[PDB]
Design a binder for this molecule. Structure first.
Ligand code: F47
Length: 289
């Protein structure tokens, strides 16, 4: 039961650029297609009927938290790129927290897609998906947007098998609680096994730390969704990385692609490739297939 007048008017104006009237939106609350800490995601239809994904924020009840979440995420409306998840709009209403309306992703998240045994994506398919992610991240980096939670679970696949970098902006949540731990300097639930060494040490995130995460995502792709560092406790991830240890080469990962992964995990952030370079390198590797 959130009230508009309470929010900063500058934020209200920004939100009203993308507002969706309740009469234009039908939500199927019995059809859950995602689960987050802030609320579930439901099959919806946006009116001419469009199939969409409706992210609930009903678990966020405080106006100060709603304001902070909207403030941090609204920039999503200014992004436009085929490999970046877009915002369809925000449904405000007299009862309940704002609903975030997102495009429906027919093939769900990339991790479950590649783990599905009937799919059996080839090495070529998987490098192609990785290339798509790199292009989306190249775009976000060019907007100086730091993702902070890039991972295979957080990329979606639409009906044409276009990969959308996701779980950012107004879509931000923890959609698989298993892979977030408070065993870190911030005390907050963080994806510690996707995080760059310097982020674990200094609590700071940059595009270069997104690059580290992208390296882990490539490793997830080549292993068809195996969990990283299964034998490393969340207590030990920092010292593991300090010792110079890294994820091992996956059986079906091409040597040059593993070289790419290792570059992404260089201890010196400035030594790691840009997403622009990653697109060029992965494109070349992809093309040999
Ligand atoms: O068809 C859709 C379904 C959910 C959304 C929300 C969203 N935004 N960013 C996201 N990152 C990840 C997931 C997600 C992860 C694991 C899972 F089992 C399920 C989902 N979801 N999501 C968007 C469209």
């Amino acid at each position: 039961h959130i009230d508009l007048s309470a929010l900063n008017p500058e934020l209200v104006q920004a939100v009203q650029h993308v507002v969706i009237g309740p009469s234009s939106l039908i939500v199927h609350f019995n059809e859950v297609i995602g689960r987050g800490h802030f609320g579930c995601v439901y099959h919806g239809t946006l009116l001419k009927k469009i199939h969409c994904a409706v992210k609930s924020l009903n678990r966020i009840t405080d106006i100060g938290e709603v304001s902070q979440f909207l403030t941090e995420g609204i920039i999503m409306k200014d992004f436009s790129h085929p490999n970046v998840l877009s915002l369809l709009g925000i449904c405000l209403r007299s009862e309940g927290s704002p609903l975030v309306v997102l495009p429906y992703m027919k093939h769900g998240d990339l991790r479950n897609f590649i783990r599905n045994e009937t799919h059996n994506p080839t090495v070529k398919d998987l490098i192609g998906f990785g290339l798509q992610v790199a292009k989306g991240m190249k775009y976000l980096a060019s907007k100086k947007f730091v993702h902070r939670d890039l991972a295979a679970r957080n990329c979606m696949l639409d009906e044409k098998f276009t990969v959308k970098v996701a779980d950012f902006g107004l879509a931000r949540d923890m959609y698989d609680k298993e892979y977030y731990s408070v065993h870190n300097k911030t005390g907050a639930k963080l994806p510690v096994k996707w995080m760059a060494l310097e982020s674990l040490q200094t609590q700071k995130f940059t595009t270069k730390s997104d690059v580290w995460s992208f390296g882990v995502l490539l490793w997830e792709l080549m292993t068809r969704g195996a969990p990283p560092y299964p034998d490393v406790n969340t207590f030990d991830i920092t010292v593991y990385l300090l010792q110079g240890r890294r994820l091992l080469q996956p059986e079906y990962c091409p040597d040059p692609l593993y070289e790419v992964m290792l570059k992404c995990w260089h201890p010196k952030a400035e030594m790691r490739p840009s997403f622009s370079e990653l697109v060029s390198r992965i494109s070349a590797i992809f093309s040999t297939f």
